[PDB]
């Protein structure tokens, strides 16, 4: 039902200073925290109005955690570059994605902790939260070390412990922002190309959460292969946008309907020009 998700990115910049580390945290589709190692005296900073009221010890605690994670991945970038025997003159990236999905009962549905190196799976915590899956031979180096250190158990304790409890605190402190389901504002626009052909575009604006279905029908027959559907985009204000467009003969606009499914809609919408 809800999820707390953290995204780490660390990459080297050969010749342009130390590596950089950026971390962001999200509750569902809403960002609430950031950390940027390129700041002088970098701090974990709020990125949501609702999370601001969190005790000052939360921000001091997570600042020291983030600074330590940044230092760890700076050394980690050299460790992994060495496993692959890559040149020091090349830039490389370590990413980490971890968090927890919680269900209605307030209990863990699934936890996860995955790392990538240069945009490809490197090592991932397995679904039993006790063992690691390494993607290639170099990642076995990491895997052996993480088993002997027992890090999977620390992940399990966090994912089944703090992660769930912190997702629930954030959900309550940001209930008005996070527990909404804003339907899309929908309309159709009409752009003549010639005397015989026109473009119909079906808009969905200002909706939250990100999940949505947009489809064109021609007398009831789906038009997915004929339509252009853009990727869902943020509007900049905490919500999302999407549209689907279709080229249609200049006298046939009335034979086409757009259909919109979204969580905030009591029923699916049907629009026509």
């Amino acid at each position: 039902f809800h999820s707390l998700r953290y995204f780490y990115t660390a990459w080297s910049r050969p010749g342009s200073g130390e590596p950089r580390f950026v971390a962001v945290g999200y509750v569902d589709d809403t960002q609430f925290v950031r950390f940027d190692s390129d700041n002088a005296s970098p701090r974990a900073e709020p990125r949501a109005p609702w999370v601001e009221q969190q005790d000052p010890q939360y921000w001091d605690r997570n600042t020291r955690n983030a600074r330590d994670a940044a230092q760890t991945y700076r050394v980690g970038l050299d460790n992994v570059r060495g496993y692959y025997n890559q040149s020091e003159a090349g830039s490389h990236t370590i990413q980490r994605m971890y968090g927890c999905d919680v269900g209605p009962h307030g209990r863990l549905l699934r936890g996860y902790d995955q790392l990538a190196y240069d945009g490809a799976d490197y090592i991932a915590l397995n679904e039993d939260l006790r063992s690691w899956t390494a993607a290639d031979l170099a990642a076995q180096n990491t895997r052996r070390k993480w088993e002997e250190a027992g890090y999977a158990e620390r992940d399990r304790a966090y994912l089944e412990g703090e992660c769930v409890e912190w997702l629930l605190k954030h959900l309550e402190n940001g209930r008005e922002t996070l527990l909404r389901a804003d339907p899309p504002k929908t309309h159709i626009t009409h752009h003549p190309i010639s005397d015989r052909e026109v473009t119909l575009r079906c808009w969905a604006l200002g909706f939250y959460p990100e999940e949505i279905t947009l489809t064109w029908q021609h007398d009831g027959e789906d038009q997915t292969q004929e339509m252009e559907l853009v990727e869902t985009r943020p509007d900049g204000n905490g919500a999302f946008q999407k549209w689907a467009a279709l080229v249609v003969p200049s006298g046939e606009e009335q034979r086409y309907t757009c259909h919109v499914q979204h969580e905030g809609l009591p029923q699916p919408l049907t629009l026509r020009w």
Binding site: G25, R61, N65, Y73, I94, D113, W146, Y158
Partner: peptide, 8 residues
């Protein structure tokens, strides 16, 4: 809270 971070 962030989780603990493990050295690769």
């Amino acid at each position: 809270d962030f989780a603990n971070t493990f050295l690769p």
